[PDB]
């Protein structure tokens, strides 16, 4: 297996469905190396549950949260954190405003090596539960031999690429975390990161982060050949008065870039009332009235969420994903999973006559090339060489009933899988 992509375990589905899944509890699990300290990076934290997620002999072990909090938000953390006293944070500069700290990664130091985790989830029991979300592993990255003269470097840039990411936080506690990973050999990592960090880029910095550095990836290490772009989120920002203003233009040549039809996954109001966890699916999927009432012409754009070959319709999505599949859905030329949702704060904007790109939050996911396998495409596999797409293809449609689900209005016509109606406020 490749890929090492995986999903969490969903609580409620039958176990077939679960066989290949992983839960915190597996990632943290003795058999995945012997633990000696752990970074935690994320945007929520439940801090009780979290440290429970850890096995007993663990619990007691060194832990950091890297976290974007502030004010009373802050404290409330510091709060939850200050009865263990392994537990310190770092708080991730938030210069602009209406950024968020997004990434979720773990880095877990054992006495064997280093482990990193880059995926999809809060720390909090919900992202966990009966979710669909998403997981990719590293390989247990061995010490380097203090003998040896090895950058322990791949060809995919991954070593740099994450020191350069940690580097951009400016953080005295990411920097023994720096200086771990420069101790280990991460030459076998197949894949490319791609972050999003905050700032205003300029000349060849705007090739660094968002959705630029996935365009300088993609024109760099995949080749061409009406292939559809898909792209899935559970967060939707708001991106102007039509599609011109940032979609279809500076964010789909970005995605369409190697060497056409806009798919885009979003659950709509019936996908969430019949969830496992019916309306309160919908606290986790914050698209806004005040957001959605400004481009209606976005949803034309809307297709349901379907998960048969993954057992999960049912369990909504809080992963995140890109793609660019054949036009039979057949093969892709590439698969991202990542944190950031369909925003010009996760993904960047072009400023100043296009020649800055604006980026207001944290974002971290993983790239799967074919050509970092030797290959010029993956085969989809159809069940959940061939990558493993988590959910149904081709996209289907919203009805012309349907309606993306939006989080602060009410919907009291009909009950949902538990008989309760949703009336925020
Ligand atoms: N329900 C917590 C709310 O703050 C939220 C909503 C969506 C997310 O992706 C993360 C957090
Ligand atoms: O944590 V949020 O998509």
Sequence with gaps: NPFQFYLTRVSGVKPKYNSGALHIKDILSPLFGTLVSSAQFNYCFDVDWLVKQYPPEFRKKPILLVHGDKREAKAHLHAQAKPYENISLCQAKLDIAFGTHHTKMMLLL????????????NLIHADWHQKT?????????????????????????????????????????????????????????????????????????????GHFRLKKLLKDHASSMSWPVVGQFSSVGSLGADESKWLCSEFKESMLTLGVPLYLIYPSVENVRTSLEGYPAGGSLPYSIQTAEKQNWLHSYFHKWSAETSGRSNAMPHIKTYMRPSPDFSKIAWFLVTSANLSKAAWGALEKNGTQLMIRSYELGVLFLPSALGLDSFKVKQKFATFPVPYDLPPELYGSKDRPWIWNIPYVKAPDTHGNMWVPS
Excluded: C, M
């Design 133 to 209: 979300q998403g997981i990719w592993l590293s390989p247990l990255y061995p010490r380097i031999a203090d003998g040896t003269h090895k950058s322990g470097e791949s060809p995919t840039h991954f070593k740099a690429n994450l020191i350069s990411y940690l580097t951009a936080y400016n953080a005295p506690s990411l920097k023994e975390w720096i200086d771990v990973i420069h101790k280990h050999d991460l030459s076998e990592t197949n894949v490319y990161l791609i972050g999003s960090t905050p700032g205003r880029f300029q000349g060849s910095q705007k090739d660094n982060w």
């Design 110 to 121: 054992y006495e064997e090596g280093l482990r990193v985790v880059i995926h999809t989830s």
